[PDB]
Write a protein that binds this ligand. Structure first.
Ligand SMILES: Nc1ncnc2c1ncn2[C@@H]1O[C@H](COP(=O)(O)OC(=O)[C@@H](N)Cc2c[nH]c3ccccc23)[C@@H](O)[C@H]1O
Ligand SMILES: Nc1ncnc2c1c(-c1ccc(Oc3ccccc3)cc1)nn2C1CCNCC1
Ligand SMILES: O=c1[nH]c2cc(Cl)ccc2o1
Lengths: 333, 321
């Protein structure tokens, strides 16, 4: 049996080139090498208040975007989190093996709490426990995420180790898979801030489903620096915007930063932004063409969700039965 | 017919205070209400305990409720962990519960100890529950369940019933501290009589029961001045159905030794029949397995209806069977 890959994305906001380079790109590339399981985490999405029609549409948008990126339902398991009850069941059990202080110290809870002061809910606080359940159910070996999820992944490793120390080899201890390029794509007008899929200023983001003409304009207005002469060189501290543009270009083309710096010797930010705009515009045009063919095929989306929940439930039920036996529950008949 | 929900915590040996004080009366109301008894093993694990002891205590609790007269054909009795909808609704309700509400109910407590009030709200709201018999320690918890139900209903429509406490209330006090209610969660086991205690144990515990220094000894009801004698009278009245004034007449010119002898005989007479049924049920694995299977099937059919309405209101894509 192949080692197992698991990862998820929220059907909230609009997925960006950041979500693609930090996660989805690795998801597509891992499908033959490993046994891959990819989840649309609708139960995590509702830790921020959603409109019911927007959430349902966004769940199906996210599924079609996975397929458009090249996630192949003949190679990978693709499913909607709420379709597998074992996620919530194991999540409750793992609350009892997680410390309050491990949750209160989380960067995501602190940032989200500041943004949504009127909805500091228990789900937002308990977010990392459900995510540990998502990973540990599938005997997961590798979790491809961006840098912002590292703290969450480290807690899932601590929970797995703590539970195993008491009860035996119930869980695998998962490892993060974080890319060398594109692990933390930054905002186009505030390159010290991560690119957000829920930004109130749309000019900060490159949306995967945004009009490529709109995206090219945003790239040309991306902030650079006051260097005289202008020089294309990677330096996050002193050249955050130029560095972020180089990181996006490297991630799209596969070229190294040193190769890009050599290609741009004697050139300035017009050549850099021209190449980033051309590469991103081409990628999004091809991606969106595949997207509409999947998004408007409800029979195919329905079949992928049915087959994926059936495959996930088989794995998850096996792990949950072992967890329930270990902690001392009377087994269900 | 109103729906009543009770959570039976597996750990802790039920006492004569639990039986004569509430369970005995609820056994006789199984035709008046749709009663649901949930053995709450998912609540249990907020406290680290031996796994084999928790499994045994779940089956001990099931067999004792059956022995006291809960009829699995009239009432729904089941193990919480056998119905996944409890955990599913609990997560959803976390997203509609303020962190501040749980704080107002440290770095080293487990998240289950912080979050169980949300699981209790899910347990109740799943079954369109009208009535919850709560202890005084659980009144704030029931108020949170009502607050969550009203908050969700105000956003999405009348998805949940707003549950009410069961207001109406036998007095059974601690044998060595007659000002404190007899409690199944007590550390001084000499303060309680468990439902499974043998006649020799019952005699020993009643004989140490605190009385007073009245001279002559007088068997009369007076909670202020004769708390221990009053408690023995209340226990004897609750077992036999004889009135306090009738018992006062019966023990005129009698000493506290006579009262204690009659209390022990009355209590052990009541427990013998409970204990026969308990050992019969507890050692019948196929009977207990069939009760749990039937109960979880009944509970899941009702719980699935509520959870589907909750998921539709939130906007989740419906599962593909
Ligand atoms: N600007 C950025 N640059 C690079 N990568 C980025 C950027 N912004 C986001 N990411 C990554 O995108 C993935 C999905 O993000 P979500 O917010 O949907 O999704 C999240 O933040 C998860 N909690 C969802 C989840 C729930 N359960 C799981 C179990 C395993 C893995 C993931 C999950 C993530 O990998 C995230 O790191
Ligand atoms: N799980 C726990 N872990 C720690 N402390 C807890 C609890 C609970 C608890 C347990 C089970 C439960 O089941 C129901 C469900 C529905 C209806 C009725 C009962 C409800 C609550 N109560 N408390 C106490 C501690 C002292 N008194 C204050 C609260
Ligand atoms: O991760 C989690 N936390 C949870 C809390 C409740 Cl009440 C139920 C399921 C859960 O899963």
């Amino acid at each position: 049996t192949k080692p197992i890959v698991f990862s998820g994305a929220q059907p909230s906001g609009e997925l960006t080139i950041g979500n693609y380079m930090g996660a989805l790109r690795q998801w597509v590339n891992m499908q033959d090498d490993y046994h891959c399981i990819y989840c649309i985490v609708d139960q995590h999405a509702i830790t921020v208040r959603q409109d019911a029609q927007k959430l349902r549409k966004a769940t199906l948008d996210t599924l079609a975007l996975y397929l458009a990126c090249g996630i192949d339902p003949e190679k990978s398991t693709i499913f909607v989190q709420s379709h597998v009850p074992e996620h919530a069941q194991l999540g409750w059990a793992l609350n009892c093996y997680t410390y309050f202080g491990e949750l209160s110290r989380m960067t995501q809870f602190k940032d989200k709490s500041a943004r949504y002061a009127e909805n500091i809910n228990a789900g937002l606080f308990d977010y990392p426990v459900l995510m540990a359940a998502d990973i540990l159910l599938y005997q997961t070996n590798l979790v491809p995420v961006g840098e912002d999820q590292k703290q969450h992944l480290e807690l899932s490793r601590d929970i797995a180790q703590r539970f195993n120390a008491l009860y035996g080899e119930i869980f695998k201890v998962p490892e993060p898979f974080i890319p060398k390029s594109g692990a933390r794509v930054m905002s186009l007008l505030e390159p010290t801030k991560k690119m957000s899929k829920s930004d109130d200023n749309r000019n900060n983001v490159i949306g995967l489903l945004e009009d490529p003409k709109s995206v090219v304009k945003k790239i040309k207005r991306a902030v650079t620096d006051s260097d005289e002469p202008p020089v294309v060189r990677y330096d996050v501290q002193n050249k955050a915007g130029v560095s972020n543009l180089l990181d996006i270009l490297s991630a799209v083309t596969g070229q190294s930063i040193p190769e890009l710096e050599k290609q741009f010797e004697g050139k300035m930010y017009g050549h850099l932004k021209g190449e980033v705009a051309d590469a991103v515009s081409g990628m999004l045009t091809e991606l969106q063409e595949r997207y509409h063919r999947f998004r408007n095929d409800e029979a195919f989306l329905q079949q992928v969700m049915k087959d994926g929940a059936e495959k996930a439930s088989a794995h998850a039920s096996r792990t949950l039965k072992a967890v329930y036996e270990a902690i001392g529950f009377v087994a269900k008949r």
